[PDB]
Amino acid sequence: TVQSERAFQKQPHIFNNPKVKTSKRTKRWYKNAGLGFKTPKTAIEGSYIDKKCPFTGLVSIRGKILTGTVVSTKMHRTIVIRRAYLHYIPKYNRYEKRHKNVPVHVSPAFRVQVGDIVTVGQCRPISKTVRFNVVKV
Amino acid sequence: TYPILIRNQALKVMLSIPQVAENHFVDIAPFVYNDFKTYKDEEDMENERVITGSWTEVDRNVFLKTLSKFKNIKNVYSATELHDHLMVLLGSRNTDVQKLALDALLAYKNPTLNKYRDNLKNLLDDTLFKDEITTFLTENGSQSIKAEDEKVVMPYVLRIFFGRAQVPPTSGQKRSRKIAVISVLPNFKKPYINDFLSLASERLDYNYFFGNSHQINSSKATLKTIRRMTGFVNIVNSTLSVLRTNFPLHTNSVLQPLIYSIAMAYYVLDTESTEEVHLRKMASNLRQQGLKCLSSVFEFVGNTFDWSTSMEDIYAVVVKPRISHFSDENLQQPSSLLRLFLYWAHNPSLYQFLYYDEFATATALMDTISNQHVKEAVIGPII
Amino acid sequence: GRQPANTKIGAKRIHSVRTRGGNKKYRALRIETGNFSWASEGISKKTRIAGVVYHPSNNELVRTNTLTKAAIVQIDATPFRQWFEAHYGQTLESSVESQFSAGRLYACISSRPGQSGRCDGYILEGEELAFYLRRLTAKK
Amino acid sequence: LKRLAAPHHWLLDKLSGCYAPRPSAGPHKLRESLPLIVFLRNRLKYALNGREVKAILMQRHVKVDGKVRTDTTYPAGFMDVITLDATNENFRLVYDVKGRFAVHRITDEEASYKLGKVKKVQLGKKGVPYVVTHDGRTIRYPDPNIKVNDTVKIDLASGKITDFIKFDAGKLVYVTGGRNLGRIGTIVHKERHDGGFDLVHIKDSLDNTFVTRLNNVFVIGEQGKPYISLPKGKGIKLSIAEERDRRRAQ
Amino acid sequence: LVTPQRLQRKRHQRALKVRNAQAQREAAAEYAQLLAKRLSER
RNA sequence: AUACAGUGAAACUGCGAAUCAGUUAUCGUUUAUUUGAUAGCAUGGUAUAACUGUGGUAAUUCUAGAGCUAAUACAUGCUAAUCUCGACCCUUUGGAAGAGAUGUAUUUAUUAGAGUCUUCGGACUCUUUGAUGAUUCAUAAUAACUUUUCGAAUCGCAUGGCCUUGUGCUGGCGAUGGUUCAUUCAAAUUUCUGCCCUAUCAACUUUCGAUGGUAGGAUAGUGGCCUACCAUGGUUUCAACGGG
Numbered sequence A: 001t002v003q004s005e006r007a008f009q010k011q012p013h014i015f016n017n018p019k020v021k022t023s024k025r026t027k028r029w030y031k032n033a034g035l036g037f038k039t040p041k042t043a044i045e046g047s048y049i050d051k052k053c054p055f056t057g058l059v060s061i062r063g064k065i066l067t068g069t070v071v072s073t074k075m076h077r078t079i080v081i082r083r084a085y086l087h088y089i090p091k092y093n094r095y096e097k098r099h100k101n102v103p104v105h106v107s108p109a110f111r112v113q114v115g116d117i118v119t120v121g122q123c124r125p126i127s128k129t130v131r132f133n134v135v136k137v
Numbered sequence B: 001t002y003p004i005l006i007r008n009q010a011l012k013v014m015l016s017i018p019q020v021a022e023n024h025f026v027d028i029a030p031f032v033y034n035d036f037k038t039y040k041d042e043e044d045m046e047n048e049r050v051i052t053g054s055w056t057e058v059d060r061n062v063f064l065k066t067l068s069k070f071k072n073i074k075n076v077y078s079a080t081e082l083h084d085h086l087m088v089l090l091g092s093r094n095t096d097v098q099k100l101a102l103d104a105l106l107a108y109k110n111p112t113l114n115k116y117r118d119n120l121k122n123l124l125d126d127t128l129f130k131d132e133i134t135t136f137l138t139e140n141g142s143q144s145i146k147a148e149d150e151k152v153v154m155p156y157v158l159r160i161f162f163g164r165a166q167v168p169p170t171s172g173q174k175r176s177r178k179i180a181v182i183s184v185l186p187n188f189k190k191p192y193i194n195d196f197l198s199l200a201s202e203r204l205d206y207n208y209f210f211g212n213s214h215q216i217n218s219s220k221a222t223l224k225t226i227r228r229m230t231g232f233v234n235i236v237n238s239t240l241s242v243l244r245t246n247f248p249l250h251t252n253s254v255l256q257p258l259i260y261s262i263a264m265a266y267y268v269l270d271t272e273s274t275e276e277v278h279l280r281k282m283a284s285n286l287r288q289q290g291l292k293c294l295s296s297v298f299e300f301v302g303n304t305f306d307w308s309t310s311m312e313d314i315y316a317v318v319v320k321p322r323i324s325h326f327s328d329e330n331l332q333q334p335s336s337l338l339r340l341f342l343y344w345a346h347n348p349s350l351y352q353f354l355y356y357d358e359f360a361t362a363t364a365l366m367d368t369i370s371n372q373h374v375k376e377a378v379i380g381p382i383i
Numbered sequence C: 001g002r003q004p005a006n007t008k009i010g011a012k013r014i015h016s017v018r019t020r021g022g023n024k025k026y027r028a029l030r031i032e033t034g035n036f037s038w039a040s041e042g043i044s045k046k047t048r049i050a051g052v053v054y055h056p057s058n059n060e061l062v063r064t065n066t067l068t069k070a071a072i073v074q075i076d077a078t079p080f081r082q083w084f085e086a087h088y089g090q091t092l093e094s095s096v097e098s099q100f101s102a103g104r105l106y107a108c109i110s111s112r113p114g115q116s117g118r119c120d121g122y123i124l125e126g127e128e129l130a131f132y133l134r135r136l137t138a139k140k
Numbered sequence D: 001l002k003r004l005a006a007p008h009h010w011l012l013d014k015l016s017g018c019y020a021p022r023p024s025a026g027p028h029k030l031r032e033s034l035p036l037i038v039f040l041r042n043r044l045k046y047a048l049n050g051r052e053v054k055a056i057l058m059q060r061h062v063k064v065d066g067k068v069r070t071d072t073t074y075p076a077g078f079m080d081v082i083t084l085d086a087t088n089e090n091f092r093l094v095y096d097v098k099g100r101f102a103v104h105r106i107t108d109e110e111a112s113y114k115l116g117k118v119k120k121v122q123l124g125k126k127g128v129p130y131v132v133t134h135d136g137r138t139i140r141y142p143d144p145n146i147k148v149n150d151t152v153k154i155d156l157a158s159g160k161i162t163d164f165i166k167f168d169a170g171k172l173v174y175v176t177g178g179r180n181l182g183r184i185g186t187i188v189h190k191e192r193h194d195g196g197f198d199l200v201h202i203k204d205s206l207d208n209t210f211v212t213r214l215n216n217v218f219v220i221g222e223q224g225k226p227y228i229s230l231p232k233g234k235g236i237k238l239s240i241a242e243e244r245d246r247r248r249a250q
Numbered sequence E: 001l002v003t004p005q006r007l008q009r010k011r012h013q014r015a016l017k018v019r020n021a022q023a024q025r026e027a028a029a030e031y032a033q034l035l036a037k038r039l040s041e042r
Numbered sequence F: 001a002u003a004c005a006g007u008g009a010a011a012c013u014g015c016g017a018a019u020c021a022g023u024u025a026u027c028g029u030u031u032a033u034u035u036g037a038u039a040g041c042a043u044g045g046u047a048u049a050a051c052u053g054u055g056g057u058a059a060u061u062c063u064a065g066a067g068c069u070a071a072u073a074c075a076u077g078c079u080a081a082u083c084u085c086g087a088c089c090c091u092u093u094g095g096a097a098g099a100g101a102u103g104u105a106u107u108u109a110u111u112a113g114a115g116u117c118u119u120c121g122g123a124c125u126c127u128u129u130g131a132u133g134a135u136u137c138a139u140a141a142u143a144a145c146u147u148u149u150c151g152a153a154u155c156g157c158a159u160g161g162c163c164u165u166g167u168g169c170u171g172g173c174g175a176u177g178g179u180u181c182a183u184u185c186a187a188a189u190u191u192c193u194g195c196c197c198u199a200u201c202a203a204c205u206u207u208c209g210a211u212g213g214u215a216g217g218a219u220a221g222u223g224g225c226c227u228a229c230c231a232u233g234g235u236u237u238c239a240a241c242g243g244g
Helices: B002-010 B021-025 B031-043 B052-068 B070-081 B091-098 B104-113 B121-132 B139-150 B156-166 B186-205 B214-232 B239-262 B272-282 B297-306 B308-316 B320-327 B336-346 B358-372 C060-064 C078-086 C127-139 D036-040 D050-057 D240-249 E004-041
Strands: A061-072 A078-083 A100-105 A117-123 A132-136 C013-019 C022-029 C033-038 C044-048 C120-123 D081-084 D089-094 D114-123 D129-133 D151-154 D161-165
Touching: A061 A132, B002 B031, B021 B031, B021 B052, B031 B052, B031 B070, B052 B070, B052 B121, B070 B091, B070 B121, B091 B104, B091 B121, B104 B121, B104 B139, B104 C044, B121 B139, B121 B156, B139 B186, B156 B186, B156 B214, B186 B214, B186 B239, B214 B239, B214 B272, B239 B297, B272 B297, B272 B308, B297 B308, B297 B320, B297 B336, B308 B358, B320 B336, B320 B358, B336 B358, C044 C078, D036 D050, D129 D151
Parallel strands: A100 A132, C033 C120
Antiparallel strands: A061 A078, A061 A117, A078 A100, A117 A132, C013 C022, C033 C044, D081 D089, D114 D129, D114 D151, D151 D161
8 A cells, every 4th residue: 555544655854866767766764773683674675654663664662672472453553462471469379360451553564463472662652552662573 | 513414304494405405415424414314305305306306316326325224214215205106006115125024025026016117126226235235244144145036036127227236336437448447446346346246146046147238247347357456556465455366256256157157148249358358367377277176267268168159259369378278287186177178178169160260279279289188197087 | 732823824923932941932823935945956945825725634724724734735936937947048857847837836844833933845746746646636 | 959868978977967968960970979068078077067168168279170169069079189289189089998989199190180981972063073971071072093981081181181091801990880889800801792781890819700780880991000099009808807817817 | 431441351352262263273183183193094 | 549449228130939669761852050162343222220209098018190310131233354275486394376165043855974016124005984772863065944043232350561652452360141062950751560448340441532543733742632534443350340
């Protein structure tokens, strides 16, 4: 796709030279916001836009990198992961079944599968409630 | 006298001591006297006077010079106080241009509402001179780059009229008609540099048409001749010499820009006068441009080599020998590539030209290039 | 939040606004002129705003023609015309060239008048031109 | 606007009234810098109370590292010198065995320079390079071989640099913080992670290594040549039991 | 009122501006000397 | 001390007026103050305070009237001048005719910001920039927009020098101000855990925002903090939701 909205989607200020000839018309902007990853081929030769993504959008990653299992993908560009971590209680002195909800903005770099494990880090706050961003599934 | 001027501006009984009114308007005094006298002339009526035409003429000259704000506003009030028929549709433009909120697009738009009447031309030229009188440090720059670019929305006759208006105070054709100029005034010499800056600004704003006015071009030549006159009339206390070096560099770079920008329907058949002035500029030291940033000397020589018409006034003097000498210096700078391109352009535009003088210049150029283009060791750009 | 601004076209009049921590912001209202820029070879000029044709979120602004960010324009073409025929010696892209004798150009606003108080246009050229002519076709 | 939760290396008792001196804004952080009031009143006892501390500051008398700075709560902290013309003294004030601020007594030719770990380096404006060290000495024009976590020798009379010091294996380092505070030595190995928790590791006579985060430590110098005379005879703080054992031996 | 002191202070402001510039743009050159030394080194 | 010179009431100006707990990031914000760097007209006008007076009013720290006069209060406003290439000389460590170059604040568009040869000593050319883990980072150039920002109309102590004794030109110490950057001190948000009892609380949130994505507005900014447009989500027997 190229549009889903009345407005236009475009990488801001990374434009081509609109006089001379190049076979891209927009230099798709490379970035990596850290964490030692190699840049993805979908970002080098991709087609989406995603201003909340950490590979073309202008948001940065650092801080709290955590993991979990994907259970919910039904929203728009944001998936909910399951940090299924066991807790401890001073009453029982045993272990118990616990998990919390963590939503994370999915990126269309690689596909959005229901069930995989992701490695997501703390970003500048993309929305009202979601705080992290997908850097790698 | 300041109390007398204030009392005569308070008690408004005009046409009772109006005997020396136009003589005082054509005479000189201080600025504290000039502000009160322009306030009195705006408080009067000027319909029937000793000479109402002379009063309007002094008002136009005051709104021209004006020191860019105050007498501009006072003379605009005087011009509205005169017979201002067909100007109530431009009184908003006059008040805006005299005011310090002179949005230049707004002034040229309110005049474009007052257009098809042509009764705003003298006021617009005086407003252009007021906006051109801005002086020094980046506010003057932000105003001048606005003014010289925004005055391009005007008539094709009125642009040459404003150029002649700049030409008027420092034309000096009666001074330079006999041999050259002999009187040196630094205050008028600075106005020559102001005319040079305004002409370069107008050329850079509109470098296709450029609007040639012949007396303005000859006055620019007279300013460059006054620069060479001061250089031969060295004033070695040398504030005047520094001013003359500031005038001649910008003057040569401006005179090269007009020819090299228009280059098709300008530079009329009287090119021998400009060739004589360039011969006077080269007779000091023809090879004084051996640097790579050789400004306007190599540009005029290369433009005369490029445009095939100018070879006649080129070969009038021996100037191709001068360009070949500056090219054939031993340790010549990176302008040697422009000199070789000049040889390429002057081979098929002088050796394919009229045989009497242009082929003679081409023969001299080929004789220079046979025994003077030996060290071809340009180890830089392979292009 | 604070009050809306909804700045209009014609008769420049700007509120003086001091905000949180210095940062003097220019709440411009009723913008009259605009600085626009050739996006492929870089020349900018102050240029007189005519109207706003497109709004990318609400056709209430296509009705009332309110100046904001990201609203496609048709503005003046005359100072770009004077430079285009006064320094070239040509006096003339092809679909940009088609917008010459129509008396209107096409561009977009990025600077917020309720925040910065400026007025910026970039002359759209290429796939921007293609998408925005398709947006003109989407309206019409 | 108040205090008494002061950093306990200030030798501050509890029954000295309630409030402690709040360090005003200056070169250093509050947690690792002592003010001139807690210096001149209850660190070397040249004064008695704040009134006469104000007297001996506005007597044009004190000169923290080249200049007067009449301010009681002035945070002249680590690696500075405090010269006084009367009492002949120069105090480079550094860390020590236990963690508090040891005074020195420094002569003039060692008192006419300090040194500084660089905190960051950039290019300031108009093409000019840009160096800032730990005390806010934003200094233009270094030598171009600039690293970060790196020691520059500040001339301290005119505020330029007089000498440059790199950092690698086999040249001294001195810790400012952590549990191992005020300790020297640099000879094990130069390990680096990413994301911190790395140190230039620390020697001992028994090869005892102390590894902290690299923001705390910085170079003094090299073997045989440190640029500061060191407190209490090069204090490495072996042991109280080893001290009593050496007491029983000799 | 124009005093002997006021134009003295104006003169001192002139001297301070010209002295700051005539130290700054020379310290630029003494930095460029070390940069040229390292450029001949590398 | 015939401008002023000591103290100096009054007044203006300047400055200052569920605690949640541990807990990371601010490459998402501003950063007053301190501290360190940092910017080539013998000096003009308001519009007034205290005060002098006229009163009202039971009265208030109530006041109106007119006469006054101050600025570091308000509002305008300025001086060629230096760095490159320097052919030639006369030897230079120069001085030179002149071919030249010229700040800052806001906004947008960019663009850059990636194996021989030997005087065995020496040379013979090799690559442009500051980094973090990471950038549209730091920084430099053009184009104009600026309801046009700043680039000192300020003060105290001495007041020394150059000699062409002008009444010249210079010159010290430091008080305030002021552009930008950094520091320091802060704020305002943000990542991870927790506390009162409950299934005689099992469903809770898209009521008139619920939860996302795209644009716009608000923002000091990341950000439904809101607007429209696209999607119909999200939470939960894990003790959620509600109540004590």
